[PDB]
Amino acid sequence: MEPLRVLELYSGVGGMHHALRESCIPAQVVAAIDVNTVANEVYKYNFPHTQLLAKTIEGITLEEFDRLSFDMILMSPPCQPFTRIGRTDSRTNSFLHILDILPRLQKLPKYILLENVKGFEVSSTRDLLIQTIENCGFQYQEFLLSPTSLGIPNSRLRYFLIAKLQSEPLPFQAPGQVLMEFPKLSVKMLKDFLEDDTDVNQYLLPPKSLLRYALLLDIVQPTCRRSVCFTKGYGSYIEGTGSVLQTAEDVQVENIYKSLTNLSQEEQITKLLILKLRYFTPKEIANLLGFPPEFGFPEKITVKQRYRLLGNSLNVHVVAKLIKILYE
Amino acid sequence: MEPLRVLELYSGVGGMHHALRESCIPAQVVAAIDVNTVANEVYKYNFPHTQLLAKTIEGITLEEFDRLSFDMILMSPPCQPFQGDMTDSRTNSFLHILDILPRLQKLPKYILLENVKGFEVSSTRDLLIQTIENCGFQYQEFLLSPTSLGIPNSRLRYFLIAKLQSEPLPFQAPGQVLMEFPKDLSVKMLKDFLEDDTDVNQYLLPPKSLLRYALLLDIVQPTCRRSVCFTKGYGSYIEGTGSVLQTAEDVQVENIYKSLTNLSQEEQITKLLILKLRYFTPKEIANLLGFPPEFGFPEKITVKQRYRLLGNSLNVHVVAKLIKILYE
Ligand SMILES: CCc1ccc(C(=O)NCC2(C(=O)N[C@@H](CC(=O)NCC(=O)NC)Cc3c[nH]c4ccccc34)CC2)cc1
Ligand SMILES: CCc1ccc(C(=O)NCC2(C(=O)N[C@@H](CC(=O)NCC(=O)NC)Cc3c[nH]c4ccccc34)CC2)cc1
């Protein structure tokens, strides 16, 4: 009788929208707003029947906002575009316009849920945002949660703020506190998130990369229940970007390591290849991020862009549970 | 106990040597080893009477390690700004260290290593631990940030302290990485780490960058008792590299935020300059890192080079306490 109209800011590749669906709450995306042409392509490919406003948030007038009549705002960080080799940030103005439009709306949205990076919870920008929603009478709670809490073998500590237009306090509210756990199963293995049709070749680490960074790598095996944070650089830079997968069981990493001693560069390359280390594929990162099994990219989107498009994405599973918590 | 001869691997700017002096333990550095020309100039400038071997660790033979007759190994991550021979020396150096340890005529009694967080779950750590266990060392790993000693800087790093002895360490937690020092410390303000000589200009934030990233910034005031991790990119890349300092006072950050609303680019740029945001100086970062007041660079070192040389540096104060804990 009362389906929620949802506004998705910085829709990117549609992580929020996907979280909306997994929450199984009565809602629908009335509008997606993002200027990234490559991201929007990914968005249409997975959400063809959803309106996508390819505009900056600052360029969307209050009249348009009132017309959309949204009851829920969902926003996650903007996709970091591969700058055209020749080589603008509307973020400050877009964020200010959001703060400026909210009090002037004809219908305040009942729900607000924002996902940002860790560290935001101490910024001056947070204090101004919190200040505005308090003036508008939102009861809120901030979180810092990693998908490991929901049993996903992937570290991705991110910031969350859930806001609800109600006078009463929230049942789980810790005033002035960032909660580190969901309000009151285990960590699955990585093999559950691996695509079995993936070309193991092509994704195998190149030999010169193995030679230089072999012992600086974080090598995980498929039975491992852990993996490090993925950044936009995965697949192009090797240090600090993510874990790599050893697709050659019954070979012990520490044995390859010790046997490299007193070997030539060529013999080490030959030895390290035995481990059959490979990158996680873009689709496999999306699995760990919680994108639905049906999620995919247009073929025109390069592998490099796919890693980049996912590097800054939210975790659909973590956001989906908070949506449920927020909706009761 | 008689005077301890200390070996400093990947000396860099000499954080390990500065920590040894702050430990106030009977020891001196008989050999500093690093191949970075820039870093070694800084090392010579501060420690002119210390032997500095500008060679790769893999290149130092066993007899020369035996002839050095060291009782303590201190190793810190290489300066990592990234020698004619084309060869990454990291792998062969680390494996060379492991292959030399058992073959030494004198095992060092003390071993202290500092590394980045995340190392404690690597296959490399496992091979390292295995080797020191088989050599008879008693060890304990830590993950400590300078805030545990009252320093207003976040910088979680990995530490391994090893000691050649039969008895276990009084604080030894087998199979655990301790997050506190084994059992004044009130976190001090950033005032006590700033330099009065510092030209507030020169380091002031430029207008172009203060317009794109103004609200993406972690702006800290001198009365604050906190700051984020500094990285090599600081002073060049704004986002994620470190906090920026607000020198103009009695001005409240959030007001300047709201006043950017509906203003033009040039009009916004003008309101933000009021905040008088400057970078932390390379020296000021060294103060937060714990380098002694006497620590300085040669003038020929560019400010850009000074920033990179400190990005991956250890914290002298935290290491110094562990050196004491180890010597007992
Ligand atoms: C140093 C720590 C810090 C401080 C501030 C911010 C931030 O966000 N200041 C607002 C901003 C924006 O437009 N922010 C964007 C997101 C963004 O840029 N994240 C950083 C990033 O991806 N860097 C590569 C919109 C947004 C999405 N979820 C949110 C939840 C709450 C408030 C705002 C948001 C004008 C610049 C971030 C980090
Ligand atoms: C992903 C997690 C991870 C895994 C491995 C390592 C590492 O260390 N693999 C050894 C090695 C090296 O050369 N290690 C260097 C340190 C280094 O490069 N750290 C990474 C960095 O600074 N990234 C910006 C020397 C060193 C100093 N303290 C130590 C304590 C124990 C063992 C080794 C060391 C190739 C031979 C680091 C992190």
Author numbering:
A (entry chain B): 1 to 87, 92 to 188, 248 to 391
B (entry chain A): 1 to 82, 88 to 188, 247 to 391
From the manuscript:
Physiologically, DNMT2 targets various tRNAs, including tRNAGly, tRNAVal, and tRNAAsp.9,12 tRNA methylation by DNMT2 plays a role in regulating RNA degradation by ribonucleases, thereby enhancing tRNA stability and overall protein expression. Additionally, tRNA m5C38 methylation improves codon recognition, particularly distinguishing between aspartate and glutamate, thus enhancing translational accuracy.
The asymmetric unit contains two very similar DNMT2Δ47-compound 3 complexes with an overall rmsd(Cα) of 0.354 Å and the largest differences in the loop region comprising residues 82 to 95. Most interestingly, compound 3 is bound in a largely hydrophobic pocket adjacent to the active site. The indole ring of compound 3 is located in a hydrophobic cave formed by Y10, M75, backbone of S76, P77, F99, L118, F124, and L133. The amide group, which connects the ethylbenzene and cyclopropane moieties, is in van der Waals contact with P78 and R95 and forms three hydrogen bonds, namely with the main chain carbonyl of L278B, with the side chain of N120, and an intramolecular H-bond to the amino group connecting the cyclopropane and indole moieties. The largest local movement upon binding of compound 3 is observed in the loop following β4 (M75 to P78), where P77 and P78 are rotated and shifted toward the SAH binding site. Moreover, the active site residue C79 is now resolved and moved into the SAH binding region. As a consequence, compound 3 acts as an allosteric inhibitor by reshaping the active site.
